[model samples]
Target: PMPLLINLIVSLLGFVATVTLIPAFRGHFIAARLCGQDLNKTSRQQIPESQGVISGAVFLIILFCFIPFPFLPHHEFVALIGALLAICCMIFLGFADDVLNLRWRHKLLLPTAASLPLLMVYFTNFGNTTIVVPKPFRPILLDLGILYYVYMGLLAVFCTNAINILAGINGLEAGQSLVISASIIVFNLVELEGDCRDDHVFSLYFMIPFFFTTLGLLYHNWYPSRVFVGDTFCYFAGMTFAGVGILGHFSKTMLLFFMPQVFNFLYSLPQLLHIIPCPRHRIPRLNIKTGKLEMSYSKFKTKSLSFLGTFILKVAESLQLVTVHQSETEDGEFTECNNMTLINLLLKVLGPIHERNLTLLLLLLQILGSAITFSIRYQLV
Candidate 1:
């Protein structure tokens, strides 16, 4: 009992010290001109971007402080370092994008490249790429072999971009992260209790500090905001989950928690694939008249659409999924198609709402997603 109590005290005091030291670095971030424009408002406010560099850096430093301890064991050490390298690679990638504003091709390529180290690590350490086939395929296990490495690459790229895509509103990125990390922590605790694995401890160790660092930044990043988390936080946070999922050998289970993000990605394919005109970002339009967010649109010439494309657009307009503004022209016509994005879709469905309320609703929807994940996975009768 004394030994157990001593360990808990050490962890709590250490975490407190870790996050408290973060404020000392904010001045450096502000001085560096690492910031972004909050376009939702009239002022076009500039707020700190990539502050994840500070928080993520601090969290990992504190986590690595445990390595020399004899209690950490050897296997956990490898997993720790492996996850560390993966997240660091992602951090640099994210910061590069923030500072340089890289093109989509670079965004697409860098994460897959950064993920190679993780794939190699997982291959050497936990090479079992076997997955359970569905019940209909009953008692079958499919080994993906070299294809598993490809799968990890795709997972890393997808997670990083998935979090990046569904963002814009204050706190949506960080708030969704907090909910996810907290839920995954609960999942790890359940595993630690029921069917303990050495890998699960690494997940807990990383996720605990991940949750706190993100929480600390949340105060500043939340609505009526002080700082913008930028692409840096999204990549760092998403890669953290991807790393944990890889090392913990629970990648599919972890992805189940990303239901909303996946749904949003699938729903936005038309615009994301350029079947509809794509914008650099898909933020909802601010209704200056009502002081609420409204759907944004992109212009497409009438001649650009074939008969089938025109039919699809008209059908979408009829279903109230998109608003099409039509006009006559000498050559033919021009059409404005509403930007296809989850943020704008919510506005259309729920009606105009405040940003904070929108963030809360999204968070709740995220919680609901994980609840369904939990009940289905852990609550099976």
Candidate 2:
């Protein structure tokens, strides 16, 4: 067993590195802009885009995911090494996209390419690991042939970006990782992988760094903010969650632990109503810019979402399962959106402190909701 004192020192160091560099990078426009912000002073010091620090941290961590050399427990040491490389390259690609505003087409391919190595490593060893069917829906997933690889690839990218987008406010991202950290630890602790060595024990090595990095960043980021995690961290953090997580025991349980995030995302449908072009007589837009409604746009303003959709969103909001906030439209009209997800709203109701409280509430909801699906559905769905 590793020395507890040594572990504590390294953990403390990780936290220090994360916190020190966040502000340091935030102060340097060059480093900050690498993730796409000019570091122009917003209130005090240069304003680093929330994407900057996250991307930097992600790149740093990805470099370390597979570093124990050949002696490490996983049989596919080479595969792990290669997967980390791929994640690094993909994260760079995403960072480039952030700076260059790369088209969606290229952006879409990056995560797929990044995850290919993980798929090859896992599938070759495990052989069509299936877990979804009691109603014969199982074969459907397997029957997809190699399409399954593409499917998993797409799901990985989608989930990563979902978490990326969720990086809207203080403590939200770290709060997310803490729950994920605790979750995989527990699941793997009980589930125990091949040879009983349990790869999750190694994951602790990774999680501790990230958990400390994220936790430390939360110190400056709480409330009024000094820095944000940015897209790199958001995307890569999600990548780590989805990647290592799928390989862990109780894959379904790991997914269940993400319920609050999932529900917060699912409840975002109400924001979509703003984009649909309706019949001339059906719904109208309040033109705050011109101070007039389009006569042809009809007399009735559209609801933020459908009635049922609104109900579902409110359910997410009332329980603080999601966050929502009002903002002025480009034309100066008041509006709220999917961007105002559950965590965003919860922050307003509960507020943020350097202490990182309220995180337990979000986590408790996830655990409680999983045990009683009926309660979640009836009360929060």
Please give the CA lDDT of all the candidate structures. 0.78, 0.52
Q: Model 1 — which ten-residue stretch has the worst lDDT?
A: 1-10
lDDT value, candidate 2, whole model = 0.52
Return the TM-score for each candidate structure: 0.89, 0.65
Q: Where is model 2 more than 4 Å wrong at Cα? A: 2-12, 30-46, 50-66, 69-74, 102-107, 132-144, 192-196, 270-340, 343-381
Q: In model 1, which runs have C-alpha deviations exceeding 4 angstroms? A: 1-31, 70-73, 135-141, 306-320, 329-332
Q: Over all chains combined, what TM-score does candidate 2 have?
A: 0.65
User: How do the residues 1-381 of candidate 1 rate in per-residue lDDT, one tens digit apiece?
Assistant: 232233344456544653464456567666888876877776676677787776777666666665555252456666768778889888888988888889989888888888877887877777678877645755653788888878888888888788889999999888888998988888987887656556666677777778877877786778877777778888888889998988788887789889888988876877787766688868887778877787777877878766767776777788888878888778677898877777878887898877888889999999998899899887854
State the lDDT at 330 in candidate 2: 50
lDDT of 1: 0.78
Summarize candidate 2's per-residue lDDT along 1-381 as a digit string, tens digits. Answer: 352234345666767766667766655644546432212112344445554345345436533533543243455464456456545655566566656666647656778887777777767666355445434555553355677666667755766666654444345665666667655555544444446444565455445555666677666655445555556566566666666654443344555666776766554434424332223122112234543222111112234445675575567567855444445545553324223345444544554422234434555655565545434323644
